[PDB]
Amino acid sequence: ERIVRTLCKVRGAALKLGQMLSNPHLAKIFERVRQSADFMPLKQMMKTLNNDLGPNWRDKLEYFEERPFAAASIGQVHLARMKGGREVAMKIQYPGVAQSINSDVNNLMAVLNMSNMLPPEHLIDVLRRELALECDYQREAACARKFRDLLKGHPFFYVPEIVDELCSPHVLTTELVSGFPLDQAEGLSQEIRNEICYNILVLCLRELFEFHFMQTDPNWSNFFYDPQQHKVALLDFGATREYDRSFTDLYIQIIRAAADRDRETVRAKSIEMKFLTGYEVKVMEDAHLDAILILGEAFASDEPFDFGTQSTTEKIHNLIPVVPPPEETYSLHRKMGGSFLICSKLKARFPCKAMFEEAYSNYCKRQAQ
Numbered sequence: 001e002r003i004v005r006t007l008c009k010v011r012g013a014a015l016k017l018g019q020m021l022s023n024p025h026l027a028k029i030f031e032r033v034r035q036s037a038d039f040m041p042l043k044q045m046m047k048t049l050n051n052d053l054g055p056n057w058r059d060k061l062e063y064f065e066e067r068p069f070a071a072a073s074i075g076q077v078h079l080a081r082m083k084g085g086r087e088v089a090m091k092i093q094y095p096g097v098a099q100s101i102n103s104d105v106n107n108l109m110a111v112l113n114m115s116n117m118l119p120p121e122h123l124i125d126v127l128r129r130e131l132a133l134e135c136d137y138q139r140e141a142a143c144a145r146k147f148r149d150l151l152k153g154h155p156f157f158y159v160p161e162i163v164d165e166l167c168s169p170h171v172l173t174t175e176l177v178s179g180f181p182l183d184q185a186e187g188l189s190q191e192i193r194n195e196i197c198y199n200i201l202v203l204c205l206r207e208l209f210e211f212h213f214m215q216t217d218p219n220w221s222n223f224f225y226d227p228q229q230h231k232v233a234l235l236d237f238g239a240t241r242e243y244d245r246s247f248t249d250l251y252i253q254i255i256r257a258a259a260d261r262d263r264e265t266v267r268a269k270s271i272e273m274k275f276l277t278g279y280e281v282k283v284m285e286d287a288h289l290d291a292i293l294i295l296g297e298a299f300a301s302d303e304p305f306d307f308g309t310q311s312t313t314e315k316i317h318n319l320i321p322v323v324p325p326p327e328e329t330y331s332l333h334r335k336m337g338g339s340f341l342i343c344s345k346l347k348a349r350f351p352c353k354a355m356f357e358e359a360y361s362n363y364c365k366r367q368a369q
Ligand SMILES: COc1cc(Nc2ccnc3cc(C#N)ccc23)cc(OC)c1OC
Pocket: 069, 077, 088, 089, 090, 091, 160, 172, 173, 174, 175, 176, 177, 178, 179, 221, 222, 235, 236, 237
């Protein structure tokens, strides 16, 4: 009834679990853990700052906010202001969180099993593995720099600059952004939500097929909408992957076949990419190909697509159906599906044929060249 309380002790691992799971009470549990004011004591955060930035770290700042704005899976964000006035956000890891992951995961699963809340061991290792990748804040900083360079001059999106002097293996600092995360934007008007989600799906297509450099686990909590500028700050860099153009090219042939309602080509190309073995049980394979074709439905229609009902987690969870499998077996579906799910959670509606034809057209222009 109040597993929430004991889960708040491992709220980081529970959050990561909920982002993978997307019984009904368990969602309410996770939603309450997420919405909990329970945060890691300041004293533990100070140890990371001292270890990483030196005992004099506070001298670099005029202000350090002791209550975090929000907690991540392995750290929390504290707002602050540098000497001179430059406002920043400082994402700070829990001390030795890397060595606490296995215990935190075991604790989370124990609480969920003993409470009879969870009716797969290999997926638990996926949880451990994903939390460990999140610990690499040096890499995350490098991905933020590269995305900022790729999106230079965009009229809608921006990436806050990294503050190198406040970055370390366990601390990532950016300039402050003015706005709020998209998990608080459900109450915005339909036109605004449509415009946000349109731009997000276009960027998804550019990340996959143009940049070959992409965030593969989209989370609406990591996009910030600035209502005044009418812009979105991108802070979602945790699972960023670069792929060879030959790999995303095969993926665009899948989406092309799904848009064209060519179920057999979707299946053949899926086998070629090693997403399917070719001898899966047909019932599961069919449900998986059904979810792909839902993606094609959107990209095949000049009429507005109703993400709120047509691409809900119910209709698209088979994009990735239940030793863990290689990440390259599902990262692109997780990206496409995750982007559709953001459109669905914000109840967006807009036509998608134009944006896919532009992406596919660029693909064809290069193919002839
Ligand atoms: C999701 O990932 C991150 C999120 C943040 N959050 C923020 C950044 C910049 N301004 C903010 C303003 C407010 C306000 N009011 C709240 C949060 C902000 C910071 C990060 O790094 C330092 C992240 O890690 C890449």
